[PDB]
Structure formats: structure tokens, C-alpha cells
Amino acid sequence: DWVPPEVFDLVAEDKARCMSEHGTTQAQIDDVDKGNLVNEPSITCYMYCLLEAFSLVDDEANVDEDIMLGLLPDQLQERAQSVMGKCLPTSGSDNCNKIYNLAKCVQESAPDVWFVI
Ligand SMILES: CCCCCCCCCCCCCCCCCCCCCC[C@@H](C)CCCCCCCCCCCCCCCCCCC
Numbered sequence: 663d664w665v666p667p668e669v670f671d672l673v674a675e676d677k678a679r680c681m682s683e684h685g686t687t688q689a690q691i692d693d694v695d696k697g698n699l700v701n702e703p704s705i706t707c708y709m710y711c712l713l714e715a716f717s718l719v720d721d722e723a724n725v726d727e728d729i730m731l732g733l734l735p736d737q738l739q740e741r742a743q744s745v746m747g748k749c750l751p752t753s754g755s756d757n758c759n760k761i762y763n764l765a766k767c768v769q770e771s772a773p774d775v776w777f778v779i
């Protein structure tokens with residue numbers, strides 16, 4: 663498991679805020695974590711919200727590739743560059759939908775390392 667244990671407490675406050683803002687349930691997060699994605703704002707806006715909180719996306723859901731790469735371990739760098747080559751730029755009807763399309767692309771491209779917290 664590539665995910666380090668330190669991340670969980672780091673994101674806790676923002677996670678709670680994002681869920682509350684968007685009406686997100688833990689069940690929805692569990693679902694997307696297992697790779698099942700639907701275009702429901704309560705989960706897609708949650709994903710945008712959490713990325714935004716950690717400066718991974720801007721005000722139009724453009725991904726900051728440098729920041730993203732900086733967060734990922736060494737063994738995932740080339741794979742991420744490859745996945746980002748495929749999945750960026752983001753597109754969609756709004757910020758949450760951009761993130762839905764991105765999540766679908768990333769999950770399909772790298773299912774074995776996919777996760778959502
Ligand atoms: C091939 C690699 C795929 C990457 C796995 C797919 C999901 C990864 C989610 C992105 C999180 C990146 C870092 C997560 C662990 C970092 C640990 C470092 C701790 C120090 C800082 C902690 C915070 C910066 C954590 C930030 C948490 C943000 C989670 C966002 C959840 C929504 C993800 C779904 C959207 C897919 C975007 C995906 C955008 C990336 C493009 C392709 C690699």
C-alpha cells in the first residue's frame with residue numbers, strides 16, 4: 663500500500679468540512695474508493711473540494727501537476743506523468759464535473775493505485 667498513514671489526520675479537518683458543505687456521505691466515498699463513480703455533485707464536489715484544499719486544483723479545476731507529483735512517491739512518478747498525459751487537461755460543465763471526468767479517466771488508467779479518502 664503506497665498510501666502513507668500520515669495523510670489521514672492531515673486531511674481530517676478539510677474532509678469533514680467538504681462532506682458537510684456538499685452533502686457527501688461516507689458510503690459515497692467508500693463507493694468511489696472501490697472504483698464506482700457516478701456524476702452526483704455530492705461526491706464530485708467533495709472530490710473537487712478536497713483537491714482544492716491541498717492546492718492540487720485551481721478555481722477552474724486545472725490540476726497543478728508539479729504539486730501532484732510532489733505528493734506522490736518515487737515509484738509512482740513516471741506512471742503519474744503518463745496518466746496526467748492522458749487525463750489532462752480537465753474538461754466538463756463545471757468544477758465538480760471536471761473532477762468527475764478526471765476521476766473516471768484516472769481510475770480507468772490506474773485502477774490498482776486508485777484511492778479516495
Ligand atoms: C498514477 C497515480 C494515480 C494517483 C492515485 C489516484 C488517486 C490519488 C488522489 C490524489 C491524492 C494525491 C496524494 C494523496 C496522498 C499524498 C500523501 C502526502 C501527504 C502530505 C500532504 C497531504 C495532502 C496534500 C493530501 C491531499 C489529499 C487529496 C485527496 C483528493 C481526493 C480526490 C481524488 C480523486 C480525484 C482524482 C485526481 C487524481 C489526480 C492525479 C492525476 C493522475 C495521477
Ligand SMILES: [Cl-]
Nearest residue numbers: 724725751752
Ligand atoms: Cl488540468
